[PDB]
Amino acid sequence: MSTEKKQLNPMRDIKVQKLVLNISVGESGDRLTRASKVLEQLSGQSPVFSKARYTVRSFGIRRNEKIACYVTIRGEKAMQLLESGLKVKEYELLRRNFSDTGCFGFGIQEHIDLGMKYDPSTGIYGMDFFVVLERAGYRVSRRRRCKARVGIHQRVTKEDAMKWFQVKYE
Amino acid sequence: MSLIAGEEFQHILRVLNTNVDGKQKIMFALTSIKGVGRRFSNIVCKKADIDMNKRAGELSAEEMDRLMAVVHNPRQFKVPDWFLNRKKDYKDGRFSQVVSNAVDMKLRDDLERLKKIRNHRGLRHYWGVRVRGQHTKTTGRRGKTVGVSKKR
Amino acid sequence: LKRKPMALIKKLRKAKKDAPAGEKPEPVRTHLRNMIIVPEMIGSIVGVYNGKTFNQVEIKPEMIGHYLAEFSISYKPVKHGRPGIGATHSS
Amino acid sequence: PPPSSKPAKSGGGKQKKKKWSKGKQKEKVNNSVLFDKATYDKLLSEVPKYKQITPSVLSERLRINGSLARQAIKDLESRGAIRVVSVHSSQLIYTRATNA
Amino acid sequence: MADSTARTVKDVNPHEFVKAYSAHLKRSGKMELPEWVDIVKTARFKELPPYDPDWYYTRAASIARKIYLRQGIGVGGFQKIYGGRQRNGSRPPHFCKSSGAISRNILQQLQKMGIIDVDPKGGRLITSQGRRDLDQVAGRVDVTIA
RNA sequence: UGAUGUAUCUUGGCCGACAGGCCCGUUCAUCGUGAUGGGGAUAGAUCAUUG
C-alpha cells in the first residue's frame, strides 16, 4: 500500500530495530559456551544462553542444556557494532542476502573485528550477524495491548533497506 | 595493579580463521601457520620487523596485525594471475600464497575440478583410487577401505 | 576472444607429427562434424582447433574426445583415452 | 611387562598417551609469576643448600621446570653471583651456588 | 704475543676461530648482497634473516681458513663442503644446497678488496694481504683457548 | 645412540633457488621429551632435465 506520494519522511525513514549476533555450534565441540567470550568482546555486552525445544536426530538428547549463545543489541551499541561489522564482509555485494522484508544478515569469525585474539580463548567461524531494520511505528506490532500486525503500508522493503544502509559507510 | 612491561598476558589468535597456536618462538610457531616452512618463517618476521625469539603469543597488538597482513600479502613479494583472461576453469592463479583455508577450499575446487572436465585425474577421484601413482603391490588401505575380510 | 602466437606448458613444443596436423584444419574451413579416428597421442593442444569433434583410439573402440570450453592447456590422451583403461577396474 | 592390544584389518593397537603438560614456558618466563622471584629462589635457591652442586638437567627434572626456562633463570642468578655454572657440550653442565 | 698467533692462524678449533674472525670482517667496506639471497638460498630454515652474525661472515671467514692450506681451490671446492646432496632413501631428503650462486658472491667481494686472485685453471691463490689479516687474527685466538 | 642449523667423466670461473645453460680447455644457537621443532605419507600447483 506503500503511500510514499505526499510530503513524506521522518516517520517513514528506517531505523535499527536490533542487531542479533548469535552463535550456533553446541557444547563439547568447542566448549561450554566459551565463544561467549568472543561475543562478549565484539559486541561489548554479555551473551545469553540458548537452550533448544523440539527435534534432533543426531546427538543432542539433553534438550534443556547449553548449546548456543546470542547478543541482541540496539541503540548506539548496535550501530557501533555495525560500523566494525559493516566494514569486514567486503562490499558491494549484494541484493540476495537482503530479505524483501528489508532485513539483512551475514557470517564470519568473531575474530573479525578489532580485537584481540589474545583475549578470546576461542574464536569460532560462523553464525549470523543479523540486522533488523524497521520504521518508527513498529512499536504497534511489538507492544502488549493493541498489537496490530504491521501493514504492507509500514513494512520495510529491500529497496528501502538497501538504500538507507547504502546511504551509510559501506 | 601496577603496569609492568607486558601485563601477564597470553594470546589467542584466529589469524586465518578458527586457529589458535602458542608456547613456541614466533619463527617456529609461524611454521605451523597455515602458511609457512622453516624456510619462509624467518623471512616474514624480519620483514615485518619481528625477532626470532619473540613468541607470537607474547607480542603486542600491532606486531601481530603486521603478521596477519604480511603473510597473505607484502613488500618485494606479490603473486597475481595474469595471462590473457582466456582459459575458463582451473589455472593456478600464480602460486596461492595465501596458503591455508583458501588453499584447502581451492583444493576442493581442484578435486571437483578434474571430474567434470573428464580428465584421467578427475576420473580417478570419482573412483577413489590414489592419483599420483603408488606401489600397489600392497599398501593403500587408506585409499579405499580397511582390510576387508577375504574377497570373493 | 583475443589471441596471438606463443603459449605455456612445461618442456613440450618443437617439431611433431604431420599426418594428424594436415587433417585438423580441414573441419575448420568445411565445418564441425564427424569425429577423427587418431591414435596419435604426442600432438600438444593449440587453441586453433577449439570446440571441435575429435576421437582417439586408446584402442578397440573409439572414445569420443571433445575439445571443450574447458579442454585445452592439458595433454591430448588424458581426456578419454585412459579413463577406459582405469574405469574398467573401478567397475 | 605388557604391551597393548593387537591390530585389526587396518590396523594397530597402541594403548598409552601420558601425564601432561604445563610449564609451557617462555610465556610464563616473560610475565612476572615464574620469573620475578619464586622460580629462582624456590626452585633454584631452595634446592642448592641440600646439595651444593647439581647438574642443570637433574635440577630440570626435580624442579619440573623447562630446560630453557631455568636456563634463563640460571643466567640471571649467575650474573648476581649467587650461582656459578661450569660447562659441557650437551648444554648440560653443573650448577653450584657458592664454593663453600 | 706473536708465538701463539702465527701458528694458530693454522691449527685452532675453528669455532673460536670463525667467531673470532667474523667481527674483524665486519669493518670492511663491502658486503653488497644485490638482493640475490632472498629467493630461497640454503638448507631449510636458512633464508638469510639470521645471517648478519650467522651466515654471511662465518661463510666469508669460512673460505678464508680453507684457502691458505688447501689452495688452489675453486667454486666447486666451496659449494660442496658444508653440503649433503646425498642419494636419498627416497623417504628423505636431507636438505638441498645450491651453491654456485652462493660461492660466487663471497669470492667477488674479496677480489675487489685484494684478498684473492685467480689462476687460469688452478682456481684462486692467497695473496700476501689475505695471509696478513687471517694470521694476525689467529693471534688473538690461541690465548683465549689456553 | 634424537632433531635442525652452523662449524669439522669431471672441472676453472660469470649467471642462477633446486633442476641448469655455457668460455676456455663432534662444535654450538635452537629442541623441552612435545603424535610436535617428531614423521614424511598423500593430494594439488608448477619448473627443468633425460627422451
From TrEMBL, chain A:
Coiled coil: none
Superkingdom as given in the UniProt entry: Eukaryota
One GO biological process term: translation
Stretches assigned to the Large ribosomal subunit protein uL5 C-terminal domain: 66-164
Boundaries of every Large ribosomal subunit protein uL5 N-terminal domain copy: 9-62
Keyword Ribosomal protein: yes
MF (Gene Ontology): RNA binding; structural constituent of ribosome
Cellular component terms per the entry's GO annotation: cytosolic large ribosomal subunit
UniProt-listed Pfam families: Ribosomal_L5, Ribosomal_L5_C
InterPro entries, A to Z: Ribosomal_uL5, Ribosomal_uL5_C, Ribosomal_uL5_CS, Ribosomal_uL5_dom_sf, Ribosomal_uL5_euk/arc-type, Ribosomal_uL5_N
Keywords: Ribonucleoprotein, Ribosomal protein
UniProt record similarity statement: Belongs to the universal ribosomal protein uL5 family.
Assembly, per entry: Component of the large ribosomal subunit.
Descriptive protein name: Ribosomal protein L11
Name of the coding gene: LOC123069149
